[PDB]
Design a protein around this ligand. Sequence first.
Ligand SMILES: O=C(O)CCC(=O)C(=O)O
Ligand SMILES: O=C(O)CCC(=O)C(=O)O
Lengths: 299, 304, 303, 302
Amino acid sequence: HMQATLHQLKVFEATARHGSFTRAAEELYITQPTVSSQIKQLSKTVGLPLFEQIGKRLYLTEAGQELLVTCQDIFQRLDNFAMKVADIKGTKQGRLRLAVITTAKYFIPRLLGEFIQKYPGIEVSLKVTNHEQIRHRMQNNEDDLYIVSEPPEEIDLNYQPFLDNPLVVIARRDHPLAGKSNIPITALNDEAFIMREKGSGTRLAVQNLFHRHYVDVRVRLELGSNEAIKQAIAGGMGISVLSQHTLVSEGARSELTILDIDEFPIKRRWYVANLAGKQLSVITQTFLDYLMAVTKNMP
Amino acid sequence: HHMQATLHQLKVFEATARHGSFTRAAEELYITQPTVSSQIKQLSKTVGLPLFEQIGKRLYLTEAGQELLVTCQDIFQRLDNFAMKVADIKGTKQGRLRLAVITTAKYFIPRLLGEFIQKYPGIEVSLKVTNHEQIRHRMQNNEDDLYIVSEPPEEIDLNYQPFLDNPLVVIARRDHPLAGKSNIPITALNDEAFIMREKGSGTRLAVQNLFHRHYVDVRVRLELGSNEAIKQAIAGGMGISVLSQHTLVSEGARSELTILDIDEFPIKRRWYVANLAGKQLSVITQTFLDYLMAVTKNMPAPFA
Amino acid sequence: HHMQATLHQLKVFEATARHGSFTRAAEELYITQPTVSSQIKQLSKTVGLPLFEQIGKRLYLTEAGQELLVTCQDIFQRLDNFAMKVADIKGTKQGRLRLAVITTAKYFIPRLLGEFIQKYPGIEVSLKVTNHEQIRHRMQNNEDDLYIVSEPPEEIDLNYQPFLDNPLVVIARRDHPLAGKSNIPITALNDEAFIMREKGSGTRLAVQNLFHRHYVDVRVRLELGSNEAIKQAIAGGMGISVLSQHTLVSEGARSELTILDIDEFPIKRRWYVANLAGKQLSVITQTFLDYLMAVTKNMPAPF
Amino acid sequence: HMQATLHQLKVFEATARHGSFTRAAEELYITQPTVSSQIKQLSKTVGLPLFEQIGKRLYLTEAGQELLVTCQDIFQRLDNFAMKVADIKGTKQGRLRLAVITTAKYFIPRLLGEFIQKYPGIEVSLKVTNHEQIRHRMQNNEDDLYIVSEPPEEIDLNYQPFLDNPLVVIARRDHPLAGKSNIPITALNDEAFIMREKGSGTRLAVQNLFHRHYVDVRVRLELGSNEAIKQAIAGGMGISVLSQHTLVSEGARSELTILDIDEFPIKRRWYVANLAGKQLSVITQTFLDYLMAVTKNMPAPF
Ligand SMILES: O=C(O)CCC(=O)C(=O)O
Ligand SMILES: O=C(O)CCC(=O)C(=O)O
């Protein structure tokens, strides 16, 4: 019974609705003898008579009544799918999956929550993790878009930069250098310093810049957590270098401050990426556009 | 619209998704791979979204594809159902029983169901053996006349009752040092090489809870999702395990297995049969329900 | 034997394993991709087993690689520890406080620890911030002077004591129709956008439970394992969530966040300071422990 | 710090142990002035004196004393990794990961069980799953060996066949055709038959052979489960075709039997595969050799 055609079902259902081959033909802009043979073929496939002529009309047999609701269910299901596809296309349904490097937690979720108010039907997933996780997900095509800091050479990606990630010297509001301008980088000599964990991107960049300019800091502490570091600074433990976006909620009157040391900010970027040769969904390309938009004139 | 799709196109798509391969699909359907290729391109144009993405040497379903695949499986199911009604008409069948049972009831239901049709050749049967999730799915859609579960879901308005006990027992190979001994305390399982079921499993839960309650530390040698695989692993002397005693129904004259007589075993579970939200039952459904209740009333577990 | 190996070799290896890439490792170590490659194979012969395997464009660490990686990390830690004793000797310091604390305590311990240091300038400090499991290993290895945990482990013999409350609260944006309202029924939450923590977490469990133990069905809009990310999600209007009130300490003057006074909240949790049972506290430990207790005794939670 | 070499620590540790440069240099088959200059360089990088001479002997400074303990730990940790590498090479420790296609559940776990008895140090994972799951594992390199019916072309694999998977017609012991021989395949026409699920491997291989010999069976039931089917057979609901390894536990006095039909068994195979280019661990190669051996002689059940 898979040998039946959709077209033969479409003829059958019309022929049952109306009571005649001819009325059906007129609806389906085909010929009455095409309808009759289509029905004979379909009855041969089913194995039973579908119709009985009584007076001027074709009435359904038991097997025909069953096939009618079978046809109605099937056509219902296709319509339903057609509705899905239409909602997808007009960004009123669908799924957006983002995997994002850790440092981007300070903007991405907020952007993403703005975007959903503007497209409520969308369902979202956000994964916030490290470079190794992200590489794995990329290898398995798990998300629509990936936001990273350093696009992995060994994976075919389509990407571009969209937002600068300055690393800046952060201090407590009462530090001597606070408010001072054009401060030479040698001024960091002998300063209590809170270092990020070994093997961190941030650590490595901070150390490289410090080796280049002969600066020797007193490492008071080593932590793995930017929040922890901000807190340690507040507590007087020292200064550090962190991504400026860690300062997003800080206002006019803050316990923290940026120092204005020369050779800073250490300049780094965030990229958007998708796998090379990927079919970008409607909402993905929509989101991509909205992203580049809101982060172009973003301080 | 979407009535421009053909049933052949959906067959080709549904087999491609299933196999993850134009080649394997073409083999199944007795067609050339370019036929597969162009049928998919055509259908894909008709829908107006991509259904597949080929990233490297790997084929993936898009969102729209994932959604069409469910649509194809519903449609095909409905055509199977119609084919069955037709056979039932042709054979002047009195009507058809619809049963969905939890996985572990495959070791008593099918056989029992054979012996039930013996008594009424006027009746036909559609047995679905599946997990709890799929049973709850079928339950929301009124898909079946009776449901057999280990744990009736709290989401649904059911009319359930228990009918057969499901004792979980310790199983070893006939040559195990504790084999044929009596009244062994549960502490003797300390350090035994043990084969655990997979993580989400309620069998695993029941066992992990009971062992935690008795401060029993076993050496987990293996995790397996399959009862049959476990039984085979026990036969090869990998260790012992805890399984539903009914899994021994399929254990023949060549079997090396035995039940160790451990204190606080069996873990007592049972099976429930369930109607749905006070909806009345056919004469068939009730003739079967009475059958179930009779035959199982005093049915001994295997290896008694 | 393995004394044939070189520390530079081990340093090249560990960077390769860490990066998943000879090129990215080569950039970090200020050297050449051929030299990384060279130095790894030189090391591989010495070991007697392959340390990596390349399938397609993917670089995988072998079983011997994975073992070597752990060995390299232990070794490098010991060298870093030696360098700290040296800087302590040469800095003519009074001594060093070692402290390991549960992840959620980063929102008070590091600040407090600064202030303590300002009070005792001869003391150096090591602050490890990590999860519960890892605090157990560290406990078993007598690694630290004091441990701060959300629940003391049963398998370890510990003197302990609670010192600060950990209220979990409902957090929302200040434009929310429930902002500024008193004595709100818990049932007001149901059918509301909600950001849920990751599966099998202290926090998610403790709110799924209290939502079924007071009959509340919520619309889960997102899943995140980062507290900061959730707060950012709330600022963007994504929904509400339940977080430790202490996560609000880093919420500056531009914050658009608030706590909703929902009935049957706060969910109440605690922090405990613990040491190994019977084991004498150093003068330094003791001085800190006293400072801790004083400062936290009447410490109000943020907002 | 970390400009220090490992040989500098080794020379340092000998020097502390003997209390002289000379006795240390004799142990390391090097000269006395290499030792001195080595220690002096190390003393520079450390930033403090490591030794002081008291009387006839070099004694450790405070820094020296700490350096000695950190050296003994480093050397210790380094020897441990060598014990592991040695244990691995001689199969006394290590990991074997197998992922197998569903139907191999009736034999792989048993063999694996027998194998582990010989090598008790080894940890094992066995994953029993479908072709799609197996492909994902193959793509992410999650296991040592894969056991499959049909290796997927789009993945680079070294593979070889090792055991036949005959599909045979199965009935209840009282079936009319039981005991018979050279039964015509057309005997099955009109016969009550229990089919495997749509899209199965087995259902396809069965529907090929039936369309080819114009065979029309009375499909009484469809089921997803080999165990269920065997039970349904036993309950009188029909006959079916299943892999012969389903019958592994059945002895001479079984409620089941195999019907000796023309064009049967449908011959299918199992293969062992690993990814191409990948080099097999020592325990993996061991297992492979063992698998081929025990299967070479192996008869199907009954
Ligand atoms: O940056 C930190 O320390 C916080 C770590 C984090 O992901 C968070 O709590 O969101
Ligand atoms: O074969 C069946 O019906 C299911 C068998 C099973 O689930 C198992 O292989 O463990």
